[PDB]
Amino acid sequence: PRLLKIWRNYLNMNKYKVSYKGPGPGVKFSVEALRCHLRDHVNVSMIEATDFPFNTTEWEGYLPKENFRTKVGPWQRCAVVSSAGSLKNSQLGREIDNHDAVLRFNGAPTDNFQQDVGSKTTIRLMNSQLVTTEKRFLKDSLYTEGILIVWDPSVYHADIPKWYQKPDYNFFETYKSYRRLNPSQPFYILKPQMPWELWDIIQEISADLIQPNPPSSGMLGIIIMMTLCDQVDIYEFLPSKRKTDVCYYHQTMGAYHPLLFEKNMVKHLNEGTDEDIYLFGKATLSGFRNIRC
């Protein structure tokens, strides 16, 4: 096939040194089993102040006051809105606001786009690349709403102390400055391992090898919300008839994230109809709270 690109990646470009030792790809999972596996083995938590070197004087007082779980959520109904241009002229704005909590990505604005993407922002998941390279992040007031979470690609299952020395993007200083400016706004840092714990499951069930790069923010977001909501609506992750190669706002596929396989997994767990995906690009997945495992 054309997956030679992946194997080529392993022989001389394994940037994250991924060494998958789990059940070879292709493991068949019923919907409920996959849901439990995802629930028990993808530990979605934030870096705590007891995690060295965040327990040192340099990081003293900089991490959020209260625990992530005992502050954010839970909620009954939630929505995950991708930044896909497929949302332009979707009119999903209303529907989207009709949820308890909403999670958006990076700099996705709501101003002037409400009718399509909604006007609410409960949680905001951002890449370390954004917070590091975007000066507007320290000024634009859109980052002031809701809760913020930033994540940074790390070496395969690297320990926090190990990751900390070799961050993909060094965003620590910018993270600090922001905290001072907005001391009351909860701003967490995803644990370095959670992306890889999720990656491991995606690989476990995929037909074959997947890109040795972490899951996209989209996939991480869907996961985060599943541990916080009873129900989760995902808009335009699984593309609709309005599929396009740009964001709904002027700054979009790639060859980094194992996007294809993340999509197949969400499709497997989708409780919605094919029509709603085609017309609305809407998928509905159950959260973890009430499942039996």
Ligand X SMILES: *[C@@H]1O[C@H](CO)[C@@H](O)[C@H](O)[C@H]1NC(C)=O
247 marked as binding residue? yes
**Which of 14, 55, 144, 177 touches ligand X by CB under 6 A?**
55
- Within 214-253, the residues that bind ligand X by CB under 6 A are none
> Following DSSP, what letter does each residue of 118-175 receive, concatenated?
-S--SEEEEEHHHHHH-GGGGT-GGGGSSEEEEE---STT--HHHHHHS-SS--HHHH
Neighbours of 249 (CB within 10 A): 17
Neighbouring-strand partners of residue 75: 229
135 marked as binding residue? no
Tokens of 17: 């040194």
Binding mask 173-212 for ligand X (x = CB under 6 A): ------------------x---------------------
Residue 159 as a binder of ligand X (CB under 6 A): the answer is: no
d(Cα 176, Cα 188) in Å, to the nearest integer?
A: 12
Size of the site for ligand X (CB under 6 A): 6
Nearer to ligand X, 191 or 257 (CB): 191
**Which of 19, 43, 98, 133 touches ligand X by CB under 6 A?**
43
What is the three-class DSSP state of 266?
A: helix
Q: Which stretch binds ligand X (CB under 6 A): 45-53, 132-140, 142-150, 169-177?
A: 45-53
Residue with tokens 């934030």: 46
d(Cα 265, Cα 259) in Å, to the nearest integer?
A: 10
Q: Which helix (H) or strand (E) holds 79?
A: strand 75-81
Residue 19 as a binder of ligand X (CB under 6 A): the answer is: no
Q: Kindly state the smallest distance separating residue 188's Cβ from ligand X, in Å.
A: 11
DSSP secondary structure letter of residue 49? T
Q: Which residues are annotated as a binding site?
A: 83, 106, 127, 216-218, 247-248, 252, 256, 263
Name the residues that contact ligand X, by CB under 6 A. Answer: 43, 45, 48, 52, 55, 191
